[PDB]
């Protein structure tokens, strides 16, 4: 978009010169550029068209396979006691990311420090699983599709 | 002419249903039913949604409908829609007895209804039903059974299911607390009084806001018991006493 | 009395309702099935059992007659109408012709049921996809499939449900006649395929076979653990 | 809304020039504040049981 | 707009535009008049010829419903042939049940109900026709009727259907009605068709006249047209 | 018609039915009415006005009998009321032809509400805009029920409908007790109808029907003129 | 406001109203006519003017005063095509009362049968609600005269003196001032007020050629349409 | 308990007897409570001129 005011033109010229020096075609010396946003439909179309970028990699959804590593990765650098059961936490909840897993492990660490202990018991993980994960659980067609 | 049609038949462009989803996401509001069994007997705890001081209760069976000599149901949804199905489901069980001189088994009563509920979703553009109801009963093949019904026409066998969306915390309690072949008619009843105490927002569980129907197999009679008033009250006094006794360790 | 066309054409030359119906098959539990020369096998995944509830009513493999076996995906209410429609026809075929029903005859009954059901007026098309398995006379084990449009084929290994193309890829690099030689090798192969899709913690797999002589038998959950253990043992020899 | 009931029960006792308050004063006070568009009617909430 | 699609909906001020639309469809059609003298009814239709476009005597709008009943349709011609089948069929069942001839007061009523029935539903549309009913009987005299697409039907002495509606009945009322033989009226009709519609848009036009009354013994038929041809010879005497 | 038969009432995305809630809005803006059940009979009291001095009161009747012991009033709209009256008249006859016995009051309301619900699900039509008050003294105990455009029945001790019904609801909540007589019930029924009335309360502005155990009885304006002396 | 299609078909509004039916109440006023009904102590007068725009139009096929049965007459306002459809229904169901029941239909019971039919047209959404009014008169045994009014919504009630058409709020306001002063009402007292109300509201002071009077009497229960001469006789008699 | 009309009577009778016993504010308040009760009264046919 081109307006008459002087608040938007400082973006467009910087964008236009970027597409110019990306495709300067004088001597680039094989410089690899990786660009990433969340959404794609509200972007600049001439950066999409070939001659510019020919790799459009999508990063789809999850599963209960990739989670168990991230549980183990986030529960590695802590005083993980020998009384904790993470497998019950894995099977029960069925939609969470690693940023959810991180928020579980931190709340588990906080609950252990409220009761003036060093190690963390399973109960701090159970409450952290029930506390933190209740912020977005909304919308499912259960028992309709086998 | 054709521009007034609401098109309840077409799939979503998402590739799923669109109108039946509205009724199933409606059905969790305003109504709380449950039922339990692990041994000889099965119960149905209900919840009086509005108890105003100017009503009569001349019927002594408000939500529970004794649809047969061996079965009953607990409906939660549109009240007017309930009278349509329960008049129909009662007549399904009776033409079976005319044909076979034998009491209707409980599964093929449920599949008889759910095929009626499905067919009014596909063809006609008719409004689907807004009813999810439960089933108790006894037969000669398995015995004491529970069933869940959906507005889609989908059903299932259960042991501690419910209906209302306020009872999502109750099913978590039932996964936390349930036994395998240890129902008495004290154990399951005190457990059901424990559930509606926490899940419903009624303070101290007024005995006129709940309703309990049980079913036992007496000799050959399959007595459907509907308990009236004071046994509920002394049950609550029993439950509050067991709460007051157990909190002494705190 | 309902006169309203529901399924019409599109300007590019496609339909709308059939492509919307096959999404419901895509949002369903996976069920695979292979065959052999003497015995067949089919299983299903994504049980997701509440583990405190009844499960004799959650069965999603049934039989039309003493030869023909079922395995569907999609939604469940529309499957029940198709099954009770098909049990009547294979029983009425036995009334006129004194044979057992051939497995090819009943798949033409289901597919012709579903095609005239997308053709007519006022009628939402079905949302299932069946796997029809049965060994005919002269001992000819075979399996067919359906489609919500009403087409049908003959495969050697099918997969449907949520994530069949991964399973179809896993069966694609599995083109061995030796796996269809030993009976228990074929069954662990299905368990190898189903564990490749679902998380499969030994309680989410329901397989069932048919030895072309007897009605179908659901295997015992000890045998599911017995087959998964020898699958783990044979896979542990990768070194 | 607890404050509003306390103010309305106070205002009812003001116009009577009285330093006392009844149970009925609060009953008309809550009924003043409980003025919503989801009207009671007994039929909005019982048809959906 | 928004309210003018069906015949079932009303306007926000309370009229029906689909009837209003079909009324001006008849208005964009050629002129047809009808007048009764003291012992009969004379029909007159201006009929357009484009260059050749047919024979001499195709698609006449002087239909003949009963043995003593005439038509003077104007508007959409295909729907006019439908009403002629309906009005024919109505008079026959009167003959079958009863067994004297149909009175003209009923045949106006029985047809206009069928016109009115197509102005209610969203299934069907209103007819785009309007027409004249002319009869004669020695017990009842002559009567002349007039149906619109809405269904409002009653009696006239002289009416006119088409583009020249107000312009033609300006000079019909200049004449007399009781002091006229219909044979005098025949040449009086032909001047009015010749007066109106100057040939600026359409060069060629025909003139079909039909005539029921005392002299034709109640039987309705066309005038002897090629015979004696006194209308057009008298009509073109008005050059100044 | 053609064969359309499509229901013009479907579920909201919230999960409620829209037209029935709008039909309840027409009932709430209707003429006020009251009904009281008082341990020996039930009293129906409506509130009938006339926009002019030119109308006639011996013509349109609000309290309408059904069998010989079952009365019926309404609070919603007028022409839709007379439809389901004639429907209920015939509906009580198939009971009496078959069973040779006067229909119980609970048995009508199961049948009338079944007419009214099934009417809303079917296509091409709108729901009714009428709520009812049905009463009767069958088998000793009297009865008082209330229906609605949704098709749901209730069993009141004393309710009110029409305009300002919540004001009449709180009034009966303090006025009604465990038990009264029939005449005391008439005196409090005129009292609660005089809450939201206008200044002229003559024998023509109200219209009252009772149910004895002796039977249904509609009150003539002579007694209502005589009973309104020192009313409320 | 407007939700769904509440401006188009007969469904409800969010305000608890509907709109098609109250459009039909002012679908009468496109007729451009006003009719007055007055009931006396032993009579019942119907008075209605007529507008004759064309000299080429009869003075016989125009008047809205119709005869349902030999003891029941009526008058129609609103549009004309919907009016005569309403009258044939009333003629048809009056005769079925004779064939089924044996005795003559009361004038009160007929208005129930009409208002039930108008209810259904309001009720089912795929058809038009017929905007036209209805006023009946007649003499009942042991009840005297009656005057009723059916409406396109579907309700009726008895009256003492009530007009309809275009001008009511001036016509009913005058009739209230006439009735509440408690005068006598014999025959010519009743006829003169039915003229002077329509005279003062319309403010015409006309010639006896437009209005028609359809009185019924206790001594002569036959529905009777008055002659133009005796209409002139009453008009000069009340004139001082 | 229940009543509305007789309450209008006793408020007027007190606002006289405070004015009889020379009370300006309280009789003014008892009159004002008498007015706002009388506003919802459907019929002051005679009590109106008494209240006025």
UniProtKB/Swiss-Prot annotation, chain A:
Which residues are modified to Phosphothreonine?
140
User: What domain of life does the UniProt record list for this protein's source?
Assistant: Eukaryota
Spell out the molecular function terms from Gene Ontology: ATP binding; ATP hydrolysis activity; proteasome-activating activity; RNA binding
Q: What Gene Ontology cellular-component terms does the record carry?
A: cytosol; membrane; nucleoplasm; nucleus; proteasome accessory complex; proteasome complex; proteasome regulatory particle, base subcomplex
Where does it localize? Answer: Cytoplasm; Nucleus; Membrane
Q: Which residues carry this modification: Phosphotyrosine?
A: 145
Give a yes or no for keyword Translocase in this entry.
no
What keywords does the record list, in alphabetical order?
Answer: Acetylation, ATP-binding, Cytoplasm, Deafness, Intellectual disability, Isopeptide bond, Lipoprotein, Membrane, Myristate, Nucleotide-binding, Nucleus, Phosphoprotein, Proteasome, Ubl conjugation
Q: Which GO terms describe its biological process?
A: proteasome-mediated ubiquitin-dependent protein catabolic process
The subunit field of the Swiss-Prot or TrEMBL record says: Component of the 19S proteasome regulatory particle complex. The 26S proteasome consists of a 20S core particle (CP) and two 19S regulatory subunits (RP). The regulatory particle is made of a lid composed of 9 subunits, a base containing 6 ATPases including PSMC1 and few additional components. Interacts with SCA7. Interacts with NGLY1. Interacts with PAAF1.
Disease involvement: Birk-Aharoni syndrome: An autosomal recessive disorder characterized by failure to thrive, severe developmental delay, intellectual disability, spastic tetraplegia with central hypotonia, chorea, hearing loss, micropenis and undescended testes, as well as mild elevation of liver enzymes.
Similarity comment: Belongs to the AAA ATPase family.
Q: Indicate what this protein is called per its UniProt record.
A: 26S proteasome regulatory subunit 4
Swiss-Prot record, chain C:
One cellular component (GO) term of this entry: nucleus
- Phosphotyrosine is found on 152
The GO annotation for biological process reads: proteasome-mediated ubiquitin-dependent protein catabolic process
Q: What is its main location?
A: cytoplasm
GO molecular function, one example? identical protein binding
What does the UniProt keyword field contain?
A: Acetylation, Cytoplasm, Glycoprotein, Host-virus interaction, Nucleus, Phosphoprotein, Proteasome
Xref: Pfam families: Proteasome (PF00227), Proteasome_A_N (PF10584)
Where is this protein found? Cytoplasm; Nucleus
**Mutating residue 152 to F: effect?**
Displays impaired G1/S transition and S/G2 progression
Function per UniProt = Component of the 20S core proteasome complex involved in the proteolytic degradation of most intracellular proteins. This complex plays numerous essential roles within the cell by associating with different regulatory particles. Associated with two 19S regulatory particles, forms the 26S proteasome and thus participates in the ATP-dependent degradation of ubiquitinated proteins.
Give the family this protein belongs to, as stated in its UniProt record. Belongs to the peptidase T1A family.
**What is the official name of this protein in its record?**
Proteasome subunit alpha type-7
Task: Identify the species of origin.
Answer: Homo sapiens (Human)
Swiss-Prot record, chain D:
Q: What is this protein called?
A: 26S proteasome regulatory subunit 8
Q: What subcellular locations does the record give?
A: Cytoplasm; Nucleus
- In terms of superkingdom, the source organism counts as Eukaryota
Summary of the function given for this chain in its UniProt record: Component of the 26S proteasome, a multiprotein complex involved in the ATP-dependent degradation of ubiquitinated proteins. This complex plays a key role in the maintenance of protein homeostasis by removing misfolded or damaged proteins, which could impair cellular functions, and by removing proteins whose functions are no longer required. Therefore, the proteasome participates in numerous cellular processes, including cell cycle progression, apoptosis, or DNA damage repair.
Family to which the UniProt record says this protein belongs = Belongs to the AAA ATPase family.
Known partners and oligomeric status:
Component of the 19S proteasome regulatory particle complex. The 26S proteasome consists of a 20S core particle (CP) and two 19S regulatory subunits (RP). The regulatory particle is made of a lid composed of 9 subunits, a base containing 6 ATPases including PSMC5 and few additional components. Component of a complex with USP49 and RUVBL1. Interacts with PRPF19. Interacts with TRIM5. Interacts with NDC80. Interacts with PAAF1. Interacts, in vitro, with the thyroid hormone receptor (in a thyroid hormone T3-dependent manner) and with retinoid X receptor (RXR). Interacts with ERCC6.
Portion of the parent chain present: 358 to 406 of 406
From Swiss-Prot, chain H:
Compartments it resides in: Nucleus; Cytoplasm, Cytosol
Q: Give the induction annotation.
A: By FOXO4; expression in embryonic stem cells (ESCs) is mediated by FOXO4.
The record's tissue-specificity note reads:
Highly expressed in embryonic stem cells (ESCs). Expression decreases as ESCs differentiate.
Post-translational note: Phosphorylated by AMPK.
Q: What does this protein do?
A: Component of the 26S proteasome, a multiprotein complex involved in the ATP-dependent degradation of ubiquitinated proteins. This complex plays a key role in the maintenance of protein homeostasis by removing misfolded or damaged proteins, which could impair cellular functions, and by removing proteins whose functions are no longer required. Therefore, the proteasome participates in numerous cellular processes, including cell cycle progression, apoptosis, or DNA damage repair. In the complex, PSMD11 is required for proteasome assembly.
How is the subunit organization of this protein annotated in UniProt? Component of the 19S proteasome regulatory particle complex. The 26S proteasome consists of a 20S core particle (CP) and two 19S regulatory subunits (RP). The regulatory particle is made of a lid composed of 9 subunits including PSMD11, a base containing 6 ATPases and few additional components.
Q: Which family does it belong to?
A: Belongs to the proteasome subunit S9 family.
Q: What is this protein called?
A: 26S proteasome non-ATPase regulatory subunit 11
Say which species the protein is native to. Answer: Homo sapiens
Name of the coding gene: PSMD11
User: What range of the intact protein is shown?
Assistant: 160 to 211 of 422
